[PDB]
Design a binder for this molecule. Structure first.
Ligand SMILES: [Zn+2]
Ligand SMILES: [Zn+2]
Lengths: 87, 152, 27, 89, 27, 149, 72
């Protein structure tokens, strides 16, 4: 029947068009997958940076503790001198 | 060989290097092109931090490779300088930095041009040509800043 | 003619994708 | 021949609809991996936010250290001054 | 019968996806 | 209402909260669940830092929202503990912290058990039941640690 | 002589070969200058998948010709 093949003809074109549409969408998601993955490369660099910022904080804390003891010594040397002179 | 160093803030440096060069050298080269002290820079490749002793070949760094560079907030040596208000400010330096180099840093912090700064260390005024090591300035040393009236 | 295997909507014979979620009949 | 031509077209429709299913399954997999990546990119935003706080902490510690330096220089002067005076007797 | 618009490879008339890259004929 | 706060280390905390609650209360709740002092945590939502004065409603945080929580390396108040060996160490503390809490932090850092610590502050030895505020311990105060014999 | 290999990425690679070169020799050359392993390479010209064992003169591949590289 000619009409029965009008059915199959129209559907095959519709299905082939849909395949085209779905593949374009697929290409777009392949594009974003790759782009995102490139951005995930940055994360290893961010972590390493955060670790240097962390070490730097601890280095400065260590400096602060050192200078704190130096000041405490001088504050002690002062107290001795004033106590003796304040006899 | 030619390699690229990319920073976290976009900028991309391109260096001329050879396989036998050690990481200490490439950091030195980075200082020449961009002024960053080696003790403030950390280099990464393939997610691995690069250690100073070893070479590019030991890491299989090849032509047109791209390293990544992260920057420390501090270095190995700091000095304190006392400002005209009495407040203390801290500078990151290296023993090789010149007094003019230091004055440039004080300007970055206090807006006072180098020609109007006089730096005093242990009663002596420092001259621009000399290095900190020449005056034997060391970590946590204190310098005193005094003003003058030349130029603008 | 066919019912979508995901959103359960029933579609016409000429439909290749679901009229609602637009998924193929055999998915 | 209508018999062969309609057998042929029929089998192609089935192949096309099978491919449609196959390609959609592929899309389903990539949508899943897209979502996992998005979660990982959420962690990156926090990683940035974290490190910016670590800088704030470093500068607070620097500020603390500078203050002790100003205090220590004060004591060193009060001490030096006091020593001169004590040599006045 | 038809040649793919991607690889320029020729596929059979009955082929719906390209036999090589597995792309639709109309893509 | 129920909200989720995400930390950098994967973990996802879930709090039961209401719109009128202030950020200080939410930080308090985070402390109850996780032990982190409020002054050590920063909360972010939609890329906006959450400030203590305002409420969840002031930031339009609603049901099933996801906050982000970043952790400071330091807090608001530190004290120093000095050993007879010359070592100075810094503790992050709160004025409400008990002497037992402080000795526990010293153990977390120097491995010497609390039963062997004597903490001396301004000529007086400190007793385990009281808080730092009870003894007038303040920012950058110095405590001295001596071991038992 | 020179030939052009056209990838689906829009990148066109140039190769210097001889018509006596086996199809394995050219896929090795493609790997050598762009890294793609040979087992993933599928070369097409004139709508023919080219046989490893055959040569370029087998398919009458003359100078300035363009092949098509598809990855599987
Ligand atoms: Zn459906
Ligand atoms: Zn193809």
């Amino acid at each position: 029947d000619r009409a029965v093949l009008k059915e199959l003809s129209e559907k095959l074109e519709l299905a082939e068009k849909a395949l085209a549409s779905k593949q374009l969408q697929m290409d777009e998601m392949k594009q974003t997958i790759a782009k995102q993955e490139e951005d995930l490369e940055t994360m290893t660099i961010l972590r390493a940076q955060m670790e240097v910022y962390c070490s730097d904080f601890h280095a400065e804390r260590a400096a602060r503790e050192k200078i704190h003891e130096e000041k405490e010594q001088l504050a002690l040397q002062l107290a001795v001198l004033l106590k003796e002179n304040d006899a | 060989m030619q390699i690229f160093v990319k920073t976290l803030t976009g900028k991309t440096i391109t260096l001329e290097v050879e396989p036998s060069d050690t990481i200490e050298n490439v950091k030195a080269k980075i200082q020449d092109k961009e002024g960053i002290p080696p003790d403030q820079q950390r280099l990464i490749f393939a997610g691995k931090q690069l250690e100073d002793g070893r070479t590019l070949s030991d890491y299989n760094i090849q032509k047109e490779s791209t390293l990544h560079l992260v920057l420390r907030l501090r270095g190995g040596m700091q000095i304190f300088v006392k400002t005209l208000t009495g407040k203390t400010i801290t500078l990151e330096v290296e023993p090789s930095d010149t007094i003019e180099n230091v004055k440039a840093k004080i300007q970055d912090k206090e807006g006072i041009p180098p020609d109007q700064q006089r730096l005093i260390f242990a009663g002596k005024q420092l001259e621009d040509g000399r290095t900190l090591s020449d005056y034997n300035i060391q970590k946590e040393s204190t310098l005193h800043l005094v003003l003058r009236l030349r130029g603008g | 003619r066919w019912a979508c295997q995901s959103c359960t909507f029933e579609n016409e014979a000429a439909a290749v994708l679901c009229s609602i979620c637009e998924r193929p009949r055999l998915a």
